[PDB]
Amino acid sequence: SEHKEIRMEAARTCSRLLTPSVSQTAVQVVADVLSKLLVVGITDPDPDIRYCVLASLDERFDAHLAQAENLQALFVALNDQVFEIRELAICT
């Protein structure tokens, strides 16, 4: 939805709509969206989207953030053009 402002709030949608959710079946649904969101955080040539996608993460997803593939996405973020993205990344 290449129109900038769609992408921003669609991120802020998917995050909060995931936040409310043992069995594999629900956890699989969390994982499925969670990675497909995270891609954008490193990917987007509109830099403040990269900012907001990272900002949308929290302790509220810490178990999946302890996953190695995601740690690579974090390490990739940990080096960047935009000082504020780096400042946010180190906290995680």
Added chain:
Amino acid sequence: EADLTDWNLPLAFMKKRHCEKIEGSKSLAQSWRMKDRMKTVSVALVLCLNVGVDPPDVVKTTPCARLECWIDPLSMGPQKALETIGANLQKQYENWQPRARYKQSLDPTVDEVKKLCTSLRRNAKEERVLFHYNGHGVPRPTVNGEVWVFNKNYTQYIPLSIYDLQTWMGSPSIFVYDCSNAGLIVKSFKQFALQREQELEVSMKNCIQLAACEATELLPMIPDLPADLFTSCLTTPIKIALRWFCMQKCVSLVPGVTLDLIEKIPGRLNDRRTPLGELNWIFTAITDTIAWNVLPRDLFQKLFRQDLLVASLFRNFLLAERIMRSYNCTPVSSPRLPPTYMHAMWQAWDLAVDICLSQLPTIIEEGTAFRHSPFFAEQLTAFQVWLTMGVENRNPPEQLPIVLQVLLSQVHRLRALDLLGRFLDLGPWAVSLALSVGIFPYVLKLLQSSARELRPLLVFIWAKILAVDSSCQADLVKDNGHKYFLSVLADPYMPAEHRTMTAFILAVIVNSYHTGQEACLQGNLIAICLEQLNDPHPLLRQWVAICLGRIWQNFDSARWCGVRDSAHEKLYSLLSDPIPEVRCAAVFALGTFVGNSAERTDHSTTIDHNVAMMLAQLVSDGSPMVRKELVVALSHLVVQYESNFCTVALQFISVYTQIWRVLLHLAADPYPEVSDVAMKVLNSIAYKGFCDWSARYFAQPVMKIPEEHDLESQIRKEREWRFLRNSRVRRQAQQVIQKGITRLDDQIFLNRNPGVPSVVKFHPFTPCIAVADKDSICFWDWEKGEKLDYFHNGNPRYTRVTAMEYLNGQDCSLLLTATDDGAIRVWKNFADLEKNPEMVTAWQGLSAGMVVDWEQETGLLMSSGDVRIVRIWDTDREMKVQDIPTGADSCVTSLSCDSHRSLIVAGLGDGSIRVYDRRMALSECRVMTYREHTAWVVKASLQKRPDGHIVSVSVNGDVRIFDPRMPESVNVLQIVKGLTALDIHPQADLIACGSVNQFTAIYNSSGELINNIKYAISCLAFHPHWPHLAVGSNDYYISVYSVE
């Protein structure tokens, strides 16, 4: 609470759809079965140095790289010290392997070289020789791979005979080239090997090579380096790593460290508890981990698992790649390796060193008891995390080579063994991955430890391996380990699961080959197995009986204990088993007990005859699988009873004929595979397996969590939306009754359907009116008013499909059909014309008149006919289990088995009505008899109700109403005196009369009447809730009636 009622409402044959789908598989690489053990011959050590004589190529400087094997010759006895270094270098190689030889070869000329290499090669040809060299006091190698030594004269040029060495090393060997242009030696070796090819046109190079630099490069001269750097790495990696490390960074975050202290780390480079053991031990794990990560799959085993002194110095090669790329070197290998220097695991090494050497500036002096490294604790945690999500089989976890070290290490073994258990409990890839990583030799060795901890651990692991693995071949039973299993077969100190696994493992050891049946005599396995018949866990009783039935393979010396300590008779307690899987497992074992008895007769004829007569009893079962396994236990008896059967077979044109009689019972069975199984076994005699289902289960994951608590689980989401719907249906379908009855002012349909009036059934919420041809299941749609289809029940056309029932109503619309000859058949998938139907089960239940009453109400099936009895059928035993007689002798023609007063009515073949308290003793069942009918009872509606009244009709030509607490017919409707079709529906309180006229007649329980409407008919029924009528009519036709 509709979806709770929908699951509370029981269902039929639920497990029976599972079993026959017996799994198969194909053999892996499974190269943990590793073959080749060419070790090493000897080390050449062509130590060409000419000590003190500068090869004129070089110009030194005072700050000179000087040390070799950490000796300086300049400050030592010159021509003497040339020996010392050779012994030193051998002693370093002996740390990596001493089980091979050494010649210390000092400035050798061609003749000396020829003697050294050819003598050693001549001692062993296929075995690996170690070529090792140093290029010192000897100029750079020639374009054509040659050398510079003769009688130690003056660094004298000599041809190296390298193209002859190429057949001296033509069979397996290894080469090391410590010189200023080694990649040139390797390149020129290819040109000579290509010249060998250019002869062979009439092993090009399997042999390993390690090159101290690439051809273009020249060695470093920084005095802080040992001069033999490539060797020094390949020989003493720890000293190098520490001595490299301490120089590298440009602020020392631990500042106390110096060269002086890293000389004096405590230990002896062979004790994990000491710091000098610990760093090596960590390094040992790291290198394998990179190798498994970054190499293509096979190459890893080929270099790092086939052979010791191949692998061990190869680990050091990666450490060399790092330091060399620090400087201006790019050392190179016989095989075409990918690069490694960058990899993240190296930073785990460097942190582990920093943690260690933070302490050493006190330990050296202050007697500090040192703090052991956290490396393994940190590592297993990461693996534990990937398991704990366990969310996939993708990018499988790289910590796997670290695990192997803790399987040995007593300090931390427990946690690792559990985690490994969970990993092995995942699907077969994880098993295959552990196996191909080389877990096997540890899992082989560790059963040496009779520690009770291996019961939930290594035994469970062994169980899951063997669940897929046929290639393990009682290995730990030709080896010592089995003594473990011989305890936890019978050891009671833990739950029966642990015995279940062990009974399976010993049942595998006897499954494998006669080695297990020998192992039976090596530990009296029969007697201790019979002790386990008594434990409650049904899959233990199964594995115990499949164990004993495999013990009685052709190894008849085992059957000697089975005879002489009465195993076969004792085992009949598991013929008294309600569980049809356990029943089959015992039936199988008695099968092989007789069958495999090496054609032994005499006293065994008398004893095995009792086994045959005892087996002959269990024909009782609607179970397809007991019906097969009974005939298969008889085909097992026939494994030696074929020695007697030819004349016995003629008797139907004692006990051999009781087997024959039982085979003659099952050959007619309405399930085609059961009639086939008995038919083919009769026929084979006339012309003259289940354990794999037990195996097919055991691969399934145990730790993974059952579904229905998850809101996203599809079984639950289907149930929760689709079946909760029926709250509105169970209301709406009765709302016209709630609101009071109205005129029959409409019809849905009047046309052909391909079925006879011998059965009619209305499906409550969903459209199939079943009206069926006498051999059929066949259908039409009441919702839309539409043709559905004919299908075949499969009974022969002199018989009659006589009744039908649904094993729910809404969700899983399973259907039963029953036949006048008895034949009971059960059906699926036709239910919304999605696809082609199948028969889930069938049996010849009831072996004049036939009747049926299924209870969705309670989970029981009932039926009656020529057996002079109402059979009551249980799906938990898969049997007829209770039996109520005709009371008189004229077999039953209409019935209800009420369970709301708990009664029966039997409308009899003599037209009398029998009413039964089904709590009375079975010879005395009569509460009432009525005789206002005396021909044949056509209708016998004992309503299953609080007002459980009787309406009944007979071939006498009259209708009457009777009350079970009165000896009489009490009241009358008889709106037509008596008629060819009637119904009295217990949730509508309406009646419909099969008028011979072109208009059907319709009336009320009040004796009132309603409008007669268009179509003598032979059957009709009202809907289970709606005050609406289906008329299965006559002449392959239906008509349907309603309010509008």
